[PDB]
Short mmCIF file of all heavy atoms in Angstrom, two decimals:
data_model
loop_
_atom_site.label_atom_id
_atom_site.label_comp_id
_atom_site.label_asym_id
_atom_site.label_seq_id
_atom_site.Cartn_x
_atom_site.Cartn_y
_atom_site.Cartn_z
N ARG W 23 -15.27 -2.46 0.57
CA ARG W 23 -14.13 -2.94 1.34
C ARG W 23 -13.87 -4.42 1.08
O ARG W 23 -12.80 -4.80 0.59
CB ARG W 23 -14.36 -2.70 2.83
CG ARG W 23 -14.13 -1.27 3.28
CD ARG W 23 -13.78 -1.21 4.75
NE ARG W 23 -12.38 -1.57 4.99
CZ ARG W 23 -11.97 -2.68 5.60
NH1 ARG W 23 -12.83 -3.58 6.04
NH2 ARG W 23 -10.67 -2.89 5.75
N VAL W 46 -14.11 10.26 7.18
CA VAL W 46 -12.88 10.82 6.64
C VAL W 46 -13.08 11.36 5.23
O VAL W 46 -12.12 11.82 4.60
CB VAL W 46 -11.74 9.79 6.67
CG1 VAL W 46 -11.56 9.25 8.07
CG2 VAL W 46 -12.00 8.67 5.70
N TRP W 48 -14.25 9.58 2.52
CA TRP W 48 -13.99 8.60 1.47
C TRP W 48 -15.29 8.02 0.94
O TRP W 48 -16.30 7.95 1.64
CB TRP W 48 -13.09 7.49 2.00
CG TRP W 48 -11.64 7.84 1.99
CD1 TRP W 48 -11.10 9.09 1.99
CD2 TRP W 48 -10.54 6.92 1.98
NE1 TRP W 48 -9.73 9.01 1.98
CE2 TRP W 48 -9.36 7.69 1.98
CE3 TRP W 48 -10.44 5.53 1.98
CZ2 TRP W 48 -8.10 7.11 1.97
CZ3 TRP W 48 -9.19 4.96 1.97
CH2 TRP W 48 -8.03 5.75 1.97
N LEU W 53 -12.29 3.48 -1.58
CA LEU W 53 -11.95 2.19 -0.99
C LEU W 53 -11.64 1.16 -2.06
O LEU W 53 -10.70 0.37 -1.91
CB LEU W 53 -13.09 1.71 -0.09
CG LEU W 53 -13.62 2.72 0.92
CD1 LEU W 53 -14.98 2.30 1.43
CD2 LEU W 53 -12.65 2.89 2.06
N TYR W 56 -8.23 1.87 -3.12
CA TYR W 56 -7.23 1.60 -2.11
C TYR W 56 -6.98 0.10 -1.96
O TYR W 56 -5.86 -0.32 -1.65
CB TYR W 56 -7.66 2.20 -0.77
CG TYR W 56 -6.56 2.32 0.24
CD1 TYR W 56 -5.78 3.47 0.31
CD2 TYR W 56 -6.30 1.31 1.15
CE1 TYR W 56 -4.77 3.59 1.24
CE2 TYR W 56 -5.30 1.42 2.08
CZ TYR W 56 -4.54 2.57 2.13
OH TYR W 56 -3.53 2.68 3.05
N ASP W 77 -11.46 13.91 -0.25
CA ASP W 77 -11.68 13.65 1.17
C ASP W 77 -11.42 14.93 1.96
O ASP W 77 -11.29 16.03 1.41
CB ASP W 77 -10.79 12.49 1.63
CG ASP W 77 -9.31 12.78 1.49
OD1 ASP W 77 -8.93 13.97 1.36
OD2 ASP W 77 -8.52 11.82 1.52
N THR W 78 -11.33 14.80 3.29
CA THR W 78 -11.11 15.95 4.15
C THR W 78 -9.70 16.51 4.04
O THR W 78 -9.36 17.44 4.78
CB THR W 78 -11.40 15.59 5.60
OG1 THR W 78 -10.38 14.71 6.10
CG2 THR W 78 -12.75 14.91 5.72
N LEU W 79 -8.87 15.98 3.14
CA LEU W 79 -7.53 16.51 2.90
C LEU W 79 -7.24 16.78 1.44
O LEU W 79 -6.20 17.38 1.13
CB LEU W 79 -6.47 15.55 3.45
CG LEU W 79 -6.48 15.36 4.97
CD1 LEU W 79 -5.63 14.19 5.38
CD2 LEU W 79 -6.01 16.62 5.67
N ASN W 112 -1.92 19.60 0.56
CA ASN W 112 -0.47 19.68 0.63
C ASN W 112 0.17 19.98 -0.71
O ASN W 112 1.38 20.24 -0.76
CB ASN W 112 0.10 18.36 1.17
CG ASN W 112 -0.67 17.83 2.36
OD1 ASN W 112 -1.24 16.74 2.30
ND2 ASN W 112 -0.69 18.60 3.44
N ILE W 114 -0.01 17.93 -3.88
CA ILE W 114 0.61 16.70 -4.36
C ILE W 114 -0.31 16.08 -5.40
O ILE W 114 -1.45 15.72 -5.10
CB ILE W 114 0.87 15.70 -3.22
CG1 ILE W 114 1.92 16.25 -2.26
CG2 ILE W 114 1.32 14.36 -3.78
CD1 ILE W 114 2.01 15.52 -0.95
N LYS W 144 4.02 21.91 -1.73
CA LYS W 144 4.15 22.96 -0.74
C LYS W 144 5.60 23.23 -0.35
O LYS W 144 5.86 24.21 0.35
CB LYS W 144 3.34 22.62 0.51
CG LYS W 144 3.76 21.33 1.19
CD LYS W 144 2.79 20.94 2.30
CE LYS W 144 2.87 21.90 3.48
NZ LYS W 144 1.94 21.51 4.57
N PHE W 145 6.54 22.38 -0.77
CA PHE W 145 7.96 22.60 -0.54
C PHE W 145 8.73 22.89 -1.82
O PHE W 145 9.95 23.07 -1.75
CB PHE W 145 8.57 21.39 0.17
CG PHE W 145 7.69 20.79 1.22
CD1 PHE W 145 6.97 19.63 0.97
CD2 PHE W 145 7.57 21.39 2.46
CE1 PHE W 145 6.16 19.09 1.94
CE2 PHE W 145 6.76 20.84 3.43
CZ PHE W 145 6.06 19.69 3.18
N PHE E 801 3.25 23.95 12.44
CA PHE E 801 3.44 22.56 12.07
C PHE E 801 3.07 22.30 10.61
O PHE E 801 3.54 21.32 10.03
CB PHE E 801 2.61 21.66 12.99
CG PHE E 801 3.14 20.27 13.13
CD1 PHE E 801 3.79 19.88 14.28
CD2 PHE E 801 2.98 19.35 12.10
CE1 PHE E 801 4.28 18.60 14.41
CE2 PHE E 801 3.47 18.07 12.23
CZ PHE E 801 4.11 17.69 13.38
N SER E 802 2.25 23.16 10.02
CA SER E 802 1.84 22.99 8.63
C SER E 802 2.94 23.35 7.64
O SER E 802 2.82 23.03 6.46
CB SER E 802 0.61 23.85 8.34
OG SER E 802 0.93 25.23 8.43
N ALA E 803 4.01 24.00 8.10
CA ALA E 803 5.03 24.49 7.19
C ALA E 803 5.95 23.37 6.72
O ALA E 803 6.43 23.39 5.58
CB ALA E 803 5.84 25.60 7.85
N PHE E 804 6.21 22.39 7.59
CA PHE E 804 7.19 21.34 7.30
C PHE E 804 6.58 19.94 7.34
O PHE E 804 7.31 18.96 7.43
CB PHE E 804 8.36 21.43 8.28
CG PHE E 804 7.94 21.55 9.71
CD1 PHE E 804 7.35 20.49 10.37
CD2 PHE E 804 8.16 22.72 10.41
CE1 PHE E 804 6.97 20.60 11.68
CE2 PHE E 804 7.78 22.83 11.74
CZ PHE E 804 7.19 21.77 12.37
N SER E 805 5.26 19.84 7.28
CA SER E 805 4.58 18.56 7.39
C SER E 805 3.52 18.41 6.31
O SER E 805 2.86 19.39 5.94
CB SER E 805 3.92 18.41 8.76
OG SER E 805 3.23 17.18 8.86
N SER E 806 3.37 17.19 5.81
CA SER E 806 2.29 16.82 4.91
C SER E 806 1.42 15.78 5.60
O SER E 806 1.89 15.04 6.47
CB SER E 806 2.82 16.27 3.59
OG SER E 806 1.75 15.88 2.74
N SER E 807 0.16 15.71 5.20
CA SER E 807 -0.82 14.85 5.86
C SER E 807 -1.54 13.99 4.85
O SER E 807 -1.84 14.44 3.74
CB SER E 807 -1.83 15.69 6.64
OG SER E 807 -1.21 16.36 7.72
N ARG E 808 -1.83 12.75 5.24
CA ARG E 808 -2.58 11.84 4.39
C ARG E 808 -3.42 10.92 5.27
O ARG E 808 -3.18 10.79 6.48
CB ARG E 808 -1.67 11.00 3.49
CG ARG E 808 -0.47 11.75 2.94
CD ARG E 808 0.24 10.96 1.86
NE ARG E 808 1.28 10.09 2.40
CZ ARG E 808 1.12 8.80 2.69
NH1 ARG E 808 -0.06 8.21 2.51
NH2 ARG E 808 2.13 8.10 3.18
N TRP E 809 -4.40 10.27 4.65
CA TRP E 809 -5.18 9.22 5.28
C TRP E 809 -4.70 7.87 4.75
O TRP E 809 -4.63 7.67 3.54
CB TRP E 809 -6.67 9.38 5.01
CG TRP E 809 -7.32 10.51 5.75
CD1 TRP E 809 -7.72 11.70 5.24
CD2 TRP E 809 -7.64 10.54 7.15
NE1 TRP E 809 -8.27 12.48 6.23
CE2 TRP E 809 -8.23 11.79 7.41
CE3 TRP E 809 -7.49 9.63 8.20
CZ2 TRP E 809 -8.67 12.15 8.67
CZ3 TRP E 809 -7.92 9.99 9.45
CH2 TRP E 809 -8.51 11.24 9.68
N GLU E 810 -4.38 6.97 5.66
CA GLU E 810 -4.00 5.60 5.34
C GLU E 810 -4.98 4.65 6.02
O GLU E 810 -5.91 5.07 6.71
CB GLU E 810 -2.57 5.31 5.79
CG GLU E 810 -1.50 5.78 4.83
CD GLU E 810 -0.11 5.36 5.26
OE1 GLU E 810 0.04 4.85 6.39
OE2 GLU E 810 0.83 5.53 4.46
N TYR E 811 -4.76 3.36 5.82
CA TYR E 811 -5.49 2.32 6.53
C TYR E 811 -4.50 1.40 7.22
O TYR E 811 -3.50 0.99 6.63
CB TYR E 811 -6.39 1.53 5.59
CG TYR E 811 -7.79 2.07 5.50
CD1 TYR E 811 -8.03 3.40 5.19
CD2 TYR E 811 -8.89 1.25 5.73
CE1 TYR E 811 -9.31 3.89 5.11
CE2 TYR E 811 -10.17 1.74 5.65
CZ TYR E 811 -10.38 3.06 5.34
OH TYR E 811 -11.66 3.55 5.26
N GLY E 812 -4.78 1.08 8.48
CA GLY E 812 -3.86 0.27 9.26
C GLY E 812 -4.58 -0.44 10.38
O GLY E 812 -5.70 -0.09 10.76
#
Side-chain angles (χ1 to χ4, degrees):
Chain W
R23 282 205 79 249
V46 306
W48 278 22
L53 311 163
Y56 197 89
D77 62 17
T78 71
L79 295 167
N112 316 118
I114 294 166
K144 60 188 291 181
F145 320 102
Chain E
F801 206 105
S802 66
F804 49 69
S805 178
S806 178
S807 294
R808 322 191 270 96
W809 287 106
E810 278 185 351
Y811 267 53

